[PDB]
Design a protein around this nucleic acid. Structure first.
Lengths: 1326, 451
DNA sequence: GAGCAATCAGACTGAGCACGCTGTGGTTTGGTTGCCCTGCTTCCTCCA
DNA sequence: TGATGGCAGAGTACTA
DNA sequence: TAGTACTCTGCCATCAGAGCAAGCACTACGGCCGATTGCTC
RNA sequence: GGCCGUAGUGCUUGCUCUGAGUUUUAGAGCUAGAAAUAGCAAGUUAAAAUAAGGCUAGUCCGUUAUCAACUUGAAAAAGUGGCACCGAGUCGGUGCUGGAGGAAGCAGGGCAACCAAACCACAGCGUGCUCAGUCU
């Protein structure tokens, strides 16, 4: 037995580990090897790393689930429509629905005529001639008053119901309102009529252009206000305009309503708010509000339709028909123009589906943007195409009726068209008149987001309670589903519990009991001093009572001055009182109590005790429920308590926020001695005046024990469950689980003895988003920089360009404009100096012409410049091009600059980890490792857990020439773990006083101490520190510079490091989601059981779950003889369950006969095999191999490459270039090492020849460039899948191993999570 | 002619003997003894072939029988100094750990030779071959010792336990002596005149005249033959004045030193590493009893070996090396101590190193018995010369007890510090030096520097 | 006049208190130096 | 949002 | 000489959007704060 | 400072919806040529599927997490693998038992001298701060 420590380094996809002794030396032992090969033992160093694929979130799975539910519900809607229509469809045409169901079927497979609607070619052709598109039929049905065929009626209704619009806008949208400026003039007329004291005229004002502008709503409102005399922003007219356009204004100022008076037309609860406001203001302004409503309707309807509505009641269909006619006319004109002016490309343009153009636009997959890109130059190089080019620029050239922009059509337009059709055709068909309501409900029903899936107890993602067990249909959803209970469960299913008592639900934040608890908790910890008192005295129980009854229930905020005067001076009659232990103003107050007092107007009711349950229920309902209707239906039982007015006011009130203390914890539990609750003690507990923490931690009382028992008893879980339950990224959670498992195995390995120390460290860790953010900011600010020169997303990915665009092309420190073309010449300056903290995000980076304009070169920007650019940044913030924190940092100086305390804090954090994720990992490891208590039931710290930041190890490597290159091999994970252990152990040995802030368990003086915490490793600091380093108090030697550096160099240069890549069974989608056209191939997968791929298309490229080794016999040749064959079979994800259910039959179906169950071997991905002279290959799939060997380049060459390439960019730098120049001859040796390793293992002859030829031809280039390009060459000899790299100009493609036959005669190695335990299975015997 | 007369006593004729007299012995286990097992440590090729013939011969003799037991400790091929006999000795670490511990009774070599009186001049050295193998092991405790031996030629693979008591067991050297003791104990009752020295496995018979040794040898062979022990005849010095025993030459009743040993010490060149010097000192230290003033003579070399010192071979170390080389060349002949007569010890102390010689009366002269020398402890190093001699006597007087067997001697020293102990200018020293039963001071007189 | 937006009692004397330094004294802890043991450990022969 | 494994097609070569 | 069989190399990968609720982790301030002053409508 | 709030960013989980995209089919292609072939005409739309599918038959569920080998197990899960040293191209080799003797280093414990520091109590003093009196 020997004392040892385990060092770990955690990444998103790698977990290094290392065992060291007391002298910082990695041990080594022989490990037994199982299996059937001759080898029975193997020697391995106790240091390595585990590599695995990164974890994934559930976002994609959730999206897929939502899509599936959406498709199911759409099919159910169509089924409802067919069920309604069947009774008469049976008489009109019996097989109509049958023909519809089998439209997707070849002619031979069809059981009816190939024509769906009428069943005969003549009628089909006639119908398609009369109505070329479905919108023509919809308009004809809406407008005509004569009888129409039931089949066509059903077709139109089915289209409308299937493709409904968006449900964003709620309420009603009368399509008849389609004017913009005429209706605005009507509104102005009504405004003048009502408010005749002052005239308001909009003559000569482009109201239509102002309102229809593409700018922001606020910008449009500001422009309209500016272009209107006699009124300013926030006026009555301005508020009406804002309400009409969508903004939510407060009309309180307009009518001095002394209330919120905020009305958002779109929200339906605000419809009731508008109702109450009309109640307030009588009827005069009611008509004005109706006019505003009409205006808003007309605005949005014109925006989305752009067609007149008076002539026809089918505005959307008419617009689609107009678009169709324009498409036809434009197409004919373009055909004629091309044929006349340029007949050399009519073919390519209108017939070639491979290239873009009309043919690729219609028959091919080209989109509108690609079509416009292809057709623009031809249009420009022509004559008489001015209007065509104008339409192209306006995005109105050759448009399809069904397009990506059709997402702005509200479902109310489709509802209106459907209702018009139903009204027209209800006379001839009585059942259409009788089922109008239910058809419209079919169209306009959607399940509320709080009800969720309508399961029946067999769905995990389901919360719902049903008043009756009948089937749910949209026509009895209200009568079956208990929406109130559904919503309550919705909310309560995601809230948290009380950790003190992890069984009860937390209380609402604004709960009255919570308010009382906080008030008393803050009140019990105050002490006062008055004349004639020996010492300060705690607040008596009766004193607290009186104070609560006279101050908190009478004023919103309690201040110590009011406490002293209103009570101590008046009641206690002590003029001289000195309060202590409390701030001038108290933090907690009965905020909810005052809110209800002004509504219910019953102090007796609010103070009475027997209605506290009622009050708690009231606040719980208000917090839980968000919709007014459900709030009212829940408060119906309490309608008797308060009049209708009070009930309406309650429904208006809305509390949001959940507390952190369960009711049981606050009030239910009672002390055994006296049966007093926490609230009772807080009200009066003798004269000790203990607070909540003291009460729960007191040993004399039973609160502590009782809480502890409940917690521990109910606290049970498994490692995996707990790790997943933690909060963080799934990749980090996976890394944590892997780290725990490797720790357990390392402990098993080292004689089942727990380590003395465990040192851990974890690493810290869009173009479309940038485009949308910059677009929104430009629209908000009204700028035209994007219009000056549009920029694509790929270009915007550049950091410099992004900064330039965010700054609106102006310097952040001076009021000047920068030039885009003159970029790559200025400097990027962080707001906070890089020395204080390390942050290269956009939130801290600022681009300026000269970095010497931030005032002080270190402190935050200078005051004056900050003030001027502070107005400019208030502007940029209203524009949202910068964040709250960014603005704060930028404007910090004015309030104050970086103080010495701030510098100290910044530097301190850079060396101390405070992340909750690291704290959780450390706590888990501590609880697992240390489980033995002492005589006083106190855990004994047998093992100490230490957490370090990566900065210490990086500084160590840079300082003592241990440079790390990540592109050489995967040994750097293991090296980082080893260095982490070494540094942590040395630090805790040298400074035992810092265990508090490192081990899990004045400013100026602090500055130099933390800055020089790692100085004892250095030799010459000119101070000459002693060779040996003692603890400083005891005699323990912590660092002997004479040898420990030699030891570290030897350990980092060991050519054997256990790199193990975790084998995983592939899971996920069955195959690629693309549906390919029909072709004669066996790779296609049928999309349904009877849709033969060779006639209907299908998927392809199925993902293999795990390969299976099968030894059997197949039939080859006409003789059908049995030839012994051993081969790898890939069990795809789709057929995995079928294979597992009966492997014998699954294999026999594929053609193999007489398989061997014993010889069947399951091979997951990344399975290892050794061949030849140490060559190792991993298993990517049943037909491809990955590399599995690592190159152990000498540390001397590693350091030379680092220094020559200048990784991460005077006398110290002077010697580095001289050193490189002296050792120029290392590049040839590095190339030789790469060549020999590739010859021995990689076996890519052509790629090796190309690499060597490129190196020979590029021998004259600078050493810096040569080393930088040689760093790339290591991609040839790496671990994992082949990948393409580049050497100067020459590029080298992948060399893939698409054959998996040799591995069948190799040695199969099963490696544990650390790789020290192996099971070598020889496959040649099979 | 001796081989013919006693066919039942010689190992060449009798062969693998058996401890007929003693019953099978049960090996007790510690209170917490629990079965343990470990896979046999793979043995080296040449080492594997060394033990294989013995296993075949041990199987024939019945010592090794196939068995299946939960205890299985590996076998160790301890190569003999001569060639590589690779005796099959079990590692037996676990068993030694699991087995109990009993009181030991093996005699230390520094006393056996003390019992030999100079009167008996005729010697007979007998060595019992396979000594440990003689004692039988009860089948109940046989599973305790086992090892895995698989040879395709033999055709048997598994555990081969020991029916006797094998080598390595930490209590084997004790039981054999105890068991063999009572056996030879009665022989002394039959032949009180003779003086038989019972080593662990070497029996030396001392007699007065040549005929007395011959009579004892014939009687001794018959007794051992009946008892079942078998002695090797190849190396058995019988009725010879010059005999080799316990690493010491025995001639004219003097504990001579072998000429071959002296060659080894001088043969080595000047050491260059602390290991080399330790090897030399190890060889030298076995002969400390012959070199006068060995402690002061080799004083320089000691600190050269010091664990944390530098091997900067000093001229004083060279002078020290030469002193040992020349001292061993003319080493005197230490006589065998006679317990009947009183002893005499000379004590001297110079420069913090105590030296002296233990002598006994030989006619009118005194014959050296053993040279005693010691480094004084640092506390006594700083004492004045008058007090330093008192400490030197106590250190050397303790050494004499390990050879005189507690018998008193004449403490002779140049000074008269014997009265100083009574009235010093330390309580432990007074009791040791004032015990008239075990120590006394004769006439004060100087002594020759060589002595 | 009403609103939004920062800004965040001077001197002298006295007593009383806070940080630091100093003198006296009591107590506690710690250290070196010296003498003793107990113990543990490492290095070299001579034999089974 | 890049990888990295599947796929089709062209080329070469071995065998009935 | 035609039929399998293996190797090599370029291509290919379902995408946008809108609401609501809960939780965590982290960073920025502010707060006690009255009375005075400023300016602006 | 604590505490208290809030303001914002990011991320995670769940639910309800939208627009497209893809695949097969319907939308009679015509003329001259036996034919390939050539010339014209047409194009915008619709139906169905949107992971195969499952039983629990719901307007439900189906892509997240977890997973070396072997033994015991129904499963949840539990068990399975000597140490030391000299080395180093992916790890190689060597060693291993007792007893006895001689020499050397080491750490710990006790005891008696001498010494430092610390705390506390009293008293004094330099500097600074709060409060009170006076003038303003």
């Amino acid at each position: 037995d020997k004392k040892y420590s385990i060092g770990l380094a955690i990444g998103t996809n790698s977990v290094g580990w290392a065992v060291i002794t007391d002298e910082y030396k990695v041990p080594s032992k022989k490990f037994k090897v199982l299996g059937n090969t001759d080898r029975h033992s193997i020697k391995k160093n106790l240091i390595g790393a585990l590599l695995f694929d990164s974890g994934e979130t559930a976002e994609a799975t959730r999206l897929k689930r939502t899509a599936r539910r959406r498709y199911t519900r759409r099919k159910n809607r169509i089924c409802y429509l067919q069920e309604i229509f069947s009774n008469e469809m049976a008489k009109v045409d019996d097989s109509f629905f049958h023909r519809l169901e089998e439209s997707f079927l070849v002619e031979e497979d069809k059981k009816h005529e190939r024509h769906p609607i009428f069943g005969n070619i003549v009628d089909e052709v006639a119908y398609h001639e009369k109505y070329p598109t479905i919108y023509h039929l919809r308009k004809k049905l809406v407008d005509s008053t004569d009888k129409a065929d039931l089949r066509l009626i059903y077709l139109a209704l089915a289209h409308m119901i299937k493709f409904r619009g968006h449900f964003l806008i709620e309420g009603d949208l009368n399509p008849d309102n389609s004017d913009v400026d005429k209706l605005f003039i009507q509104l102005v007329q009504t405004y003048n009529q009502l408010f005749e004291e002052n005239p308001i005229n909009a003559s000569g004002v482009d109201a239509k252009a102002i309102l229809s502008a593409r700018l922001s709503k606020s910008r449009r409102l500001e422009n309209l206000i500016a272009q209107l005399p006699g009124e300013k922003k926030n006026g009555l007219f301005g508020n009406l305009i804002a309400l009409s356009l969508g903004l939510t204004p407060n009309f309180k100022s307009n009518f001095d309503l002394a209330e919120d008076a905020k009305l958002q037309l779109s929200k339906d609860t605000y419809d009731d708010d508008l109702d109450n406001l009309l109640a307030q203001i009588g009827d005069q302004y009611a008509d004005l509000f109706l006019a505003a409503k009409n205006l808003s309707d007309a605005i949005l309807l014109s925006d989305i339709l752009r067609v007149n509505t008076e002539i026809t009641k089918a505005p959307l269909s008419a617009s689609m028909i107009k678009r169709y006619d324009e498409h036809h006319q434009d197409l004919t004109l373009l055909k004629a123009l091309v044929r006349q002016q340029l007949p050399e490309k009519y073919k390519e343009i209108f017939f070639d589906q491979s290239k873009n153009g009309y043919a690729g636009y219609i028959d091919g997959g080209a989109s509108q943007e690609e079509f416009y890109k292809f057709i623009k130059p031809i249009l420009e190089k022509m004559d008489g195409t001015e209007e065509l080019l104008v339409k192209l620029n306006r995005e109105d050239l050759l448009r399809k009726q069904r397009t990506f922009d059709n997402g702005s059509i509200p479902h109310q337009i489709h509802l209106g068209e459907l209702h018009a059709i139903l009204r027209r055709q209800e006379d001839f068909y009585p059942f259409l008149k009788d089922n109008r309501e239910k058809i419209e409900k079919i169209l306009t029903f959607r399940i509320p987001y709080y009800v969720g899936p309508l399961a029946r107890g067999n769905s995990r993602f389901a919360w719902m309670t049903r008043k009756s067990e009948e089937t749910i249909t949209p026509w009895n959803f209200e009568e079956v589903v208990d929406k109130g209970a559904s919503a309550q469960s919705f909310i309560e299913r995601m809230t948290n519990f009380d950790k003190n008592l992890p069984n009860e639900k937390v209380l609402p934040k604004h709960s009255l009991l919570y308010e009382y608890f906080t008030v008393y908790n803050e009140l019990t910890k105050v002490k006062y001093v008055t004349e004639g008192m020996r010492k300060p005295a705690f607040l008596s129980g009766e004193q607290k009572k009186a104070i609560v009854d006279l101050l908190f229930k009478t004023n919103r905020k309690v201040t110590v001055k009011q406490l002293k005067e209103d009570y101590f001076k008046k009641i206690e009659c002590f003029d001289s009182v000195e309060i202590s232990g409390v701030e001038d103003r108290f933090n907690a107050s009965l905020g909810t109590y005052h809110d209800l007092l002004k509504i219910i107007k019953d102090k007796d009711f609010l103070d009475n005790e027997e209605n506290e349950d009622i009050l708690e229920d009231i606040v719980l309902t208000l917090t839980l429920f968000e919709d007014r209707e459900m709030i009212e239906e829940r408060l119906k039982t309490y309608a008797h308590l308060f009049d209708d007015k009070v009930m309406k006011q309650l429904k208006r009130r809305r509390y949001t926020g959940w507390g952190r203390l369960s009711r049981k914890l606050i009030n239910g539990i009672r002390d055994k001695q006296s049966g007093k609750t926490i609230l009772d003690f807080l009200k009066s507990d003798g004269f000790a005046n203990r607070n909540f923490m003291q009460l729960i931690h007191d040993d004399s009382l039973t609160f502590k024990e009782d809480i502890q028992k409940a917690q521990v008893s109910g606290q049970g879980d498994s490692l995996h469950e707990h790790i997943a339950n933690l909060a963080g990224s799934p990749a980090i959670k996976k890394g944590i689980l892997q780290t725990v498992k490797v720790v357990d195995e390392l402990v098993k390995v080292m004689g089942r003895h727990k380590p003395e120390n465990i040192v851990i460290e974890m690493a810290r860790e869009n173009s479309r988003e940038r485009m949308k953010r910059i677009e929104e900011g430009i629209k908000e600010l009204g700028s035209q920089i994007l219009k000056e020169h549009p920029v694509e997303n790929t270009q915007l990915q550049n950091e410099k360009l992004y900064l330039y665009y965010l700054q609106n092309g102006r310097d952040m420190y001076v009021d000047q404009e920068l030039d885009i073309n003159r970029l790559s010449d200025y400097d990027v300056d962080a707001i906070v100096p890089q020395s204080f903290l390390k942050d290269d995000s956009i939130d801290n980076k600022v681009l300026t012409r000269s970095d010497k304009n931030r005032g002080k070169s270190d402190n935050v920007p200078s005051e004056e410049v900050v003030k001027k650019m502070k107005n400019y940044w208030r502007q940029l913030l209203n524009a949202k091009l910068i964040t709250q924190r960014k603005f704060d940092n930028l404007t910090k100086a004015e309030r104050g600059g970086l103080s010495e305390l701030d510098k100290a804090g910044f530097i301190k954090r850079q060396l101390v980890e405070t992340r909750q994720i690291t704290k959780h990992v450390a706590q888990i490891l501590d609880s697992r490792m240390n489980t033995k208590y002492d005589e006083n039931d106190k855990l004994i710290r047998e093992v100490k857990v230490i957490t370090l930041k990566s900065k210490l190890v990086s500084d160590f490597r840079k300082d003592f020439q241990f440079y790390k290159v990540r592109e050489i091999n995967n040994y750097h994970h293991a090296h980082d773990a080893y260095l982490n252990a070494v540094v942590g152990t040395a630090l805790i040995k040298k400074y035992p006083k810092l265990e508090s802030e490192f081990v899990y368990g004045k400013a100026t003086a602090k500055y130099f101490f933390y800055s020089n915490i790692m100085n004892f490793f250095k030799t010459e600091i000119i101070r000459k520190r002693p060779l040996i380093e003692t603890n400083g108090e005891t005699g323990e030697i912590v660092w002997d510079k004479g040898r420990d550096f030699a030891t570290v160099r030897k350990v980092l240069s060991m050519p054997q490091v256990n790199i193990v890549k975790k084998t995983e069974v592939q899971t996920g989608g069955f195959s690629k989601e693309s549906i390919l056209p029909k072709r004669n191939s066996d790779k296609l997968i049928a999309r349904k059981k009877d849709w033969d791929p060779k006639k209907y298309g299908g998927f392809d490229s199925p993902t293999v779950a795990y390969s299976v080794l099968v030894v059997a016999k197949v039939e080859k040749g006409k003789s059908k003889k049995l030839k012994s064959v051993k081969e790898l079979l890939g069990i795809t994800i789709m057929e995995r369950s079928s294979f597992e259910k009966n492997p014998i039959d699954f294999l026999e179906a594929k053609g193999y006969k007489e398989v061997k169950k014993d010889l069947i071997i399951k091979l997951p991905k990344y399975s290892l095999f050794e061949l030849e002279n140490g060559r190792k290959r991993m298993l990517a799939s049943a037909g491809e191999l990955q590399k599995g060997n690592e190159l152990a380049l000498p540390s001397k060459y590693v350091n030379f490459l680092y220094l020559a390439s200048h990784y991460e960019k005077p006398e110290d730098n002077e010697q580095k270039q001289l050193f490189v120049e002296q050792h120029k001859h290392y590049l040839d040796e590095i190339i030789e090492q790469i060549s020999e390793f590739s010859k021995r293992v990689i076996l890519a002859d052509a790629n090796l020849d190309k690499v060597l030829s490129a190196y020979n031809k590029h021998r004259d280039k600078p050493i810096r460039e040569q080393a930088e390009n040689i760093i790339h060459l290591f991609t040839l000899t790496n671990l994992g899948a082949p990948a393409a790299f580049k050497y100067f100009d020459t590029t080298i493609d992948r060399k893939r191993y698409t054959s998996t036959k040799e591995v069948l005669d190799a040695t199969l190695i099963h490696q544990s999570i650390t790789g020290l335990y192996e099971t070598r299975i020889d496959l040649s015997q099979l | 002619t001796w081989l013919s007369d006693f066919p039942q006593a010689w190992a060449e004729t009798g062969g693998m003997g058996l401890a007929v007299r003693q019953a099978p012995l049960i090996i007790p286990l510690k209170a917490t003894s629990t079965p343990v097992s470990i896979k046999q440590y793979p043995m080296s090729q040449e080492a594997r072939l060394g033990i294989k013939p013995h296993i075949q011969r041990l199987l024939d003799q019945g010592i090794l029988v196939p068995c299946q037991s939960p205890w299985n400790t590996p076998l160790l091929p301890v190569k003999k100094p001569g060639t590589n006999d690779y005796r099959p000795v079990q590692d037996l670490r676990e068993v030694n750990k699991r087995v109990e511990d009993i009181h030991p009774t093996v005699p230390n070599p520094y006393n056996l030779l003390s019992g030999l009186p100079p009167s008996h001049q005729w010697y007979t050295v007998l060595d019992l071959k396979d000594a440990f193998f003689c004692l039988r092991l009860h089948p109940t405790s046989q599973p305790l010792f086992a090892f895995e031996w698989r040879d395709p030629e033999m055709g048997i693979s598994g555990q081969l336990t020991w029916t006797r008591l094998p080598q390595g067991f930490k209590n084997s050297p004790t039981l054999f002596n105890e068991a063999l003791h009572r056996d030879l104990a009665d022989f002394r009752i039959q032949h009180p005149d003779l003086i038989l020295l019972q080593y662990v496995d070497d029996l030396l018979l001392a007699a007065t005249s040549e005929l007395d040794c011959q009579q004892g040898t014939r009687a001794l062979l018959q007794t051992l033959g009946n008892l079942g022990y078998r002695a090797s005849a190849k190396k058995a010095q019988i009725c010879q004045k010059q005999v080799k025993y316990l690493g010491y030459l025995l001639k004219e009743g003097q504990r001579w030193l072998t000429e071959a040993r002296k060659e080894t010490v001088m043969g080595q060149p000047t050491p260059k590493t602390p290991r080399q010097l330790r090897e030399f000192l190890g060889k030298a230290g076995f002969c400390r009893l012959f070199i006068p003033g060995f402690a002061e003579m080799a004083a320089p070399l000691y600190p050269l070996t010091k664990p944390g010192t530098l091997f900067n071979w000093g001229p004083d170390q060279q002078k020290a090396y030469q002193e040992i080389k020349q001292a061993l060349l003319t080493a005197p002949a230490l006589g065998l101590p006679d317990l009947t007569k009183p002893f005499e010890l000379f004590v001297d102390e110079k420069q913090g190193y105590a030296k002296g010689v233990l002598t006994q009366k030989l006619g009118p002269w005194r014959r050296p018995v053993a040279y005693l020398s010691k480094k004084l402890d640092p506390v006594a190093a700083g004492w004045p010369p008058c007090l330093r001699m008192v400490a030197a006597i106590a250190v050397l007087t303790k050494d004499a007890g390990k050879l005189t067997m507690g018998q008193p001697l004449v403490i002779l020293a140049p000074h008269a510090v014997e009265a100083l102990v009574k009235q010093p200018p330390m309580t432990h020293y007074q009791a040791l030096l004032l015990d008239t039963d075990r120590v006394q001071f004769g006439p004060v007189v100087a002594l020759n520097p060589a002595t």
